[model samples]
Target chain A: TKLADVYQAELRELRLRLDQLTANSARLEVERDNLAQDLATVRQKLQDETNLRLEAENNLAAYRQEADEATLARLDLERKIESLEEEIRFLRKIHEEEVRELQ
Target chain B: TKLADVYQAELRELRLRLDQLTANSARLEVERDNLAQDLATVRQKLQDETNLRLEAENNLAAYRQEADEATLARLDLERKIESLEEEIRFLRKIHEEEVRELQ
Candidate 1:
């Protein structure tokens, strides 16, 4: 009876200890999986943000281009009005001089 | 005496073996710690990137709205200018007729 080679109570205690460790490790592994899932979600969100920023930059550039064209057209109109005013003033002065000479 | 020497040699060997096992265990623990740290960093980076993408998306939306508003404003200004030009022409024509009649 090799039962002398093993103390039954101690053997039972060791088995119980091993079961506790196994159960604890199982719980920790589940938690680890959840954290990994959360990390993946965070990564996806980051990629989305990067893409959105890039699109916004493109929109800004296009808007700037349109603004430039509009500015040019408005400047042209302003120049035309100023030149017309100067021409009218000159003609009016010439008419006044002709009338004074006639008088 | 020979048996004592052999026993002493076995003790030293056992001690060396224990030291090596301890070192291996320490190395494994360090590896585990490093992996845990790396996992945490990865998660944080993903979260940050996600937030950055979302923020960029918001910026894009804002800029697009701004561009639309600017275009509308420019269109409205041009229309106003056209109407004012017509009014100026009509007023000038009337003034010219009045001046000729007075003369």
Candidate 2:
């Protein structure tokens, strides 16, 4: 009976060791899976960032182009005013010459 | 001699089983360490992705705001141009009156 008790203790220890091993394996497997899921999420986020940057760059370029066009249009309008004033000055000089001849 | 041989055989079997368990445990430990290293890399990537996404979002917001402002500014500039043309028409009428008086 004493010998049997010793064998029983040995068996119990073996069972405990196996249980510990099983628990460790299960926990590590869970950890691996979690890491995989996290990696996937991070990758998706990276893709989102890439797409957003592209969109932003396109939008900024469009804004810059429009601003450039607006500046050109303003310059064109001012140039038109300058040309009109030049024509007025030329016509005024002709009128002055006509008046002097009349006098 | 027979009993001694049996005991030796039992000892050998125990040692073999212990060696196998030890090898398995060692393999599992190595696997765990490798998994931990891989998880660290994945986490680092996640952090990098988070930062990248934040920066992209900031850029998008700034770009959108700039685009809004540019559109508004263009509208204001065109209105000014429109008023300048009106002023030119009024000036031309006054100039015509002055010329008739001069004549």
Candidate 3:
């Protein structure tokens, strides 16, 4: 009878420990699942942000090219204006000389 | 004796199940921690990418403004050249008339 009583107490303690561990395991499983889900969400967001960054970089390159082309065009126009003005001065000098000779 | 045998078998089974649950719980804890760490890393990466995107956008805006200014300057130069050319044509016409009169 004493042995049976001891066995009963041991079994009871084991049962209680099993119950506690089962509850703890369930909780841990839930937490693990939640963490996994959150990780997936963050990874997806990172991928989206990475794509956006790449697109922005591409746009920046295009804008820079546009600016460079515009600058080159402006410089060319400036040079053309200078040449035209010089031609105008030369023509005026020649006209003045002709008028003087006629007088 | 039969009760003792039954109690012994029950205790053994319970012990085995408890051990299994403990191991599973530990594994789950490890996985959860790893997932949390990965989430932190991904979140930081996303923030860095976001900042890079914003910087690229700002640079794009600056380049666009530069392109616009250059275009405006080029147009102004073109108009100036047109006016100068017109003046030159007028001067040439006047010079030609003067020469004809002298003849």
Best by TM-score: 3
RMSD of each: 7.8, 6.0, 3.1
In candidate 2, position A46 carries an lDDT of: 61
lDDT (tens digit, per residue) of candidate 1 on B60-91? 56666665666665676667667656756765
**Model 3 lDDT per residue over B18-90, tens place:** 8899888889989988988988898899889889888887787777787788777878888998999899889
Ranking by TM-score: 3, 2, 1
Please tell me which model should have the higher TM-score, number 1 or number 3: 3
- Which predicted model would earn the best lDDT? 3
Task: State every prediction's TM-score relative to the real structure.
Answer: 0.52, 0.59, 0.79
Top model number, DockQ: 3
Q: Which residue pairs clash in candidate 3?
A: none
Of 1 and 3, which scores higher on lDDT?
3
The lDDT, on a scale of 0 to 1, for candidate 2 is: 0.65
The Cα error of candidate 3 at residue A7, in Å, is 2.0
TM-score of chain B of each: 0.72, 0.92, 0.69
Residue pairs with colliding backbones in model 1 are A45-B50, A46-B49, A46-B50, A49-B53
Clash totals in order:
4, 0, 0
